[PDB]
């Protein structure tokens, strides 16, 4: 034994003498673990960054649309119904506040936002538009619904916005990040670790300097190490469910709200009789495409993974003058965490 880069070992099969002790054998074992990890990391890095990219972009891309619709709706009220301000500035704000909240997962009932909107809207119409000239507010809020002053305009808006706000209310992007990030942390069996050590490092224990492991030996070893991991391939390919969803807006619906609200005109068509009774009573899509394009190029990630480890490590794919795990030969002859990834790949929710 020069520079290296009896017998009672527990990994390297000693044909005779050996250059390494039980302690250098344990060194070689931990560096195999570190090496496999780095290789898995490198395999998953480009895909991991791709989904991290788009998850950050797409998340920022809806709050802008809600702010823009709010200001447009506020401006249209200021310009066309100045007698309804500043009260309109308040119930418009109340509604679009709930819009964003509902988008981002809060417990918000859409039929409210619409109903609170029209419950807040009708008293100021009555007092300022229909019969110009505070204690009587609550009667008018109740008579709004008891007398159905807006007809089916609230229901129309309810269905218009509930359909668009439900679809907008990311899980799959973040889950892909979470499974792919799990891959570089996969713990393998102890037998796989002993075999990885024999494949990569035990040749140095026999005193060889340049000999590389046979590719065939690498595949038998890798197919044995990644036996549970390859089962994930079919669930990862079922990418396709994501491609199905991207069947796909909220801007037009929210921008169109003032027009529908203005068609107020219905109510005033009945101001005459209605007053009397109340008197008595009281590139985005382009980004989706490019993501799916790049994502399909990684559809074989879990099936190509054992070949990646073998190809991105020094091997004699020629299977000549190579290390078989215990001797230099002339020609080579012969789950929990995994199941959680399977279970999560639940998301295949993707019931377009």
């Amino acid at each position, epitope marked *: 034994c020069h520079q290296v880069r009896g017998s009672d070992l527990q990994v390297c099969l000693p044909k005779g003498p050996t250059c390494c002790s039980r302690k250098m054998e344990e060194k070689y074992q931990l560096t195999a673990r570190l090496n496999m990890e780095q290789l898995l990391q490198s395999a998953s890095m480009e895909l991991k960054f791709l989904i991290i990219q788009n998850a950050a972009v797409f998340q920022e891309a809806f709050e802008i649309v809600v702010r823009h619709a709010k200001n447009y709706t506020n401006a249209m009220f200021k310009n066309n119904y100045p007698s309804l301000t500043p009260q309109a500035f308040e119930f418009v704000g109340e509604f679009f506040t709930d819009v964003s909240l509902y988008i981002l997962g809060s417990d918000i009932n859409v039929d409210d936002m619409v109903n609170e909107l029209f419950d807040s809207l009708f008293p100021v119409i009555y007092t300022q538009l229909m019969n110009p000239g505070l204690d009587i507010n609550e009667c008018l809020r109740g008579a709004r619904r008891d007398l159905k002053v807006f007809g*089916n305009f609230p229901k*129309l*808006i309810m269905t*218009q916005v509930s359909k668009s706000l439900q679809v907008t209310r990311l899980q799959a992007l973040n889950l892909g990040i979470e499974v792919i990030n799990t891959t570089d942390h996969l713990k393998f069996s102890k037998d796989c670790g002993r075999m990885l050590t024999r494949m990569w490092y035990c040749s140095y224990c026999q005193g060889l300097m340049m000999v590389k492991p046979c590719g065939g030996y690498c595949n038998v070893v890798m197919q044995g190490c990644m036996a549970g991991v390859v089962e994930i391939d079919k669930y990862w390919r079922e990418i396709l469910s994501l491609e199905e969803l991207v069947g796909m807006d909220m801007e*037009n619906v929210l921008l*169109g709200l003032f*027009s*529908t609200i203005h*068609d107020i005109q219905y109510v005033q068509k009945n101001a005459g009789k209605l007053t009397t009774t109340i008197g008595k009573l009281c590139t985005l899509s382009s980004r989706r495409r490019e993501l799916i394009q790049k994502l399909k190029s990684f559809i074989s990630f879990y099936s190509a993974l054992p070949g990646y480890i073998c190809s991105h490590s020094p091997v004699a794919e020629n299977d000549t003058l190579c290390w078989n795990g215990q001797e230099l030969v002339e020609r080579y002859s012969q789950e929990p965490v995994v199941s959680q990834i399977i279970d999560k790949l639940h998301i295949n929710l993707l019931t377009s």
Partner: nanobody
Amino acid sequence: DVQLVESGGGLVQPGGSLRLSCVASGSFRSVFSSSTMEWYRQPPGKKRELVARIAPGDGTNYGALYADSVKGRFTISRDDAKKTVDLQMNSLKPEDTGVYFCASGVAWGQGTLVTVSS
């Protein structure tokens, strides 16, 4: 299901004519007569633009508006008994190529392709 359903799109030569028809379906049929109906065009690689609008009628007249690009060539009409809005398109030009959508303030159709080419 509530659907605005466009039809009558197709291929036509320059100077030809087409009639687009949009049918209001779903029991939207009750509000159609009180709804403004609109036709929009989306040319290839361009934004969607208003082509024609027709107001609700009082039984004697409809207020019709047209984009300047189609003025004197196109005619919007509506049949409240059938719940249809039609766009008669005459003296078609290559610039009239696009997907045509009927709309209301609450609903959009899926659109129909018009191609004006030799």
